Design a protein around this ligand. Structure first.
Ligand SMILES: O=C(O)[C@@H](Cl)Cc1cnc[nH]1
Ligand SMILES: [Mg+2]
Length: 321
């Protein structure tokens, strides 16, 4: 029920300041952009729905790999502590915890994410399902507070969903290098990476028939409207998903149907969009198996295991110091 440890390194005023800075920088850039972290206001609900769309294969593909190989993953890791870069709300989390329990290894769960309220809820759910488990939640941002994750036990750190694909190569390398420097001998990283495949399937996964992804994308405008007193007309922006073959990444864009004039009153800022002008809201890099090995090695980690679905749509790596 209520048994919990929670460390909170984020402040409400500090997040508000981060949004101010990001929106000012992004809307005044020669090529306009907004960071996708701001998708996930209570947007989080829309993303949950996205994971169940027929076109969006990543979640169910990763889940099926875990469903059939979690015992092997847990045996390879030999960890008694599961660290999740994420909130611990998924079935995937339970697949891993179940296997750790079956192996009589499980002692501790450490969820790491940016919303304290969700960490509390997940902690209560996990606590009830795995009596005796120690839960140490950390509210922090995984590009700054990784050093705050406790080093107790032998740790399996998981970063699922190909969320690592939201980082472009330079910040991605810095992230993996930093994460690797918080690991001890005996610790393991379990990394989910979505893989290069048919480009039609890729684009459709980010431009579903039902329009749910379009709603998710346009909602970042609603976040700016509410939080920074802006007047984006959401109906005036078209959802566009692109495959960038040079960078091998999916991109989400918002395209102005007609010229728009947007005042972001909280920033004392007026922003103009030309008819047809596009603003970048997300990248989702896709990986080649051989390159995953290389990126891990450059970060100081040796890939010891690789799991992929029979179609080769998605990959999971286990890597060690
Ligand atoms: O890049 C993804 O696939 C996840 Cl992390 C976020 C997302 C899902 N649909 C649009 N963006
Ligand atoms: Mg003013």
């Amino acid at each position: 029920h209520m048994a919990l440890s929670l460390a909170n390194y984020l402040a409400a005023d500090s997040a508000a300041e981060a949004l101010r800075r990001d929106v000012r920088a992004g809307l005044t850039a020669t090529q306009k952009s907004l960071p996708p972290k701001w998708f996930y206001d209570a947007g989080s609900d829309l993303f949950d729905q996205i994971t169940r769309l027929p076109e969006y294969y990543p979640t169910r593909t990763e889940a099926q790999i875990l469903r059939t190989r979690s015992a092997e993953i847990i045996s390879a890791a030999g960890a008694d502590t599961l660290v999740e870069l994420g909130s611990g709300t998924s079935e995937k989390t339970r697949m891993l915890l179940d296997a750790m329990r079956d192996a009589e290894l499980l002692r501790r769960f450490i969820p790491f994410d940016v919303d304290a309220g969700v960490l509390r809820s997940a902690g209560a759910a996990i606590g009830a399902e795995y009596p005796g488990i120690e839960i140490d939640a950390v509210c922090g941002d995984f590009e700054e507070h990784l050093g705050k994750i406790p080093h107790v036990g032998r740790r399996l750190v998981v970063f699922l969903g190909s969320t690592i694909g939201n980082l472009t190569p330079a910040p991605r390398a810095e992230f993996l290098s930093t994460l690797a420097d918080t690991l001890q001998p005996g610790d393991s990283l379990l990394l989910g990476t979505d893989l290069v495949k048919d480009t039609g399937r890729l684009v459709r996964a980010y431009d579903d028939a039902a329009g749910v992804t379009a709603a998710f994308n346009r909602n970042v405008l609603a976040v700016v409207n509410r939080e920074l007193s802006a007047d984006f007309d959401l109906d005036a922006f078209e959802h566009v998903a692109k495959w960038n073959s040079d960078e091998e990444r999916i991109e989400m864009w918002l395209r102005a149907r007609t010229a728009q004039h947007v005042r972001v009153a909280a920033l004392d800022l007026e922003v103009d969009f030309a008819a047809g002008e596009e603003m970048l809201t997300e990248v989702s890099c896709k990986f080649r198996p051989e390159n995953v090995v290389a990126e891990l090695a450059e970060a100081g980690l040796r890939q010891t295991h690789w799991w992929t679905d029979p179609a080769g749509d998605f990959g999971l790596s286990l890597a060690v110091r």
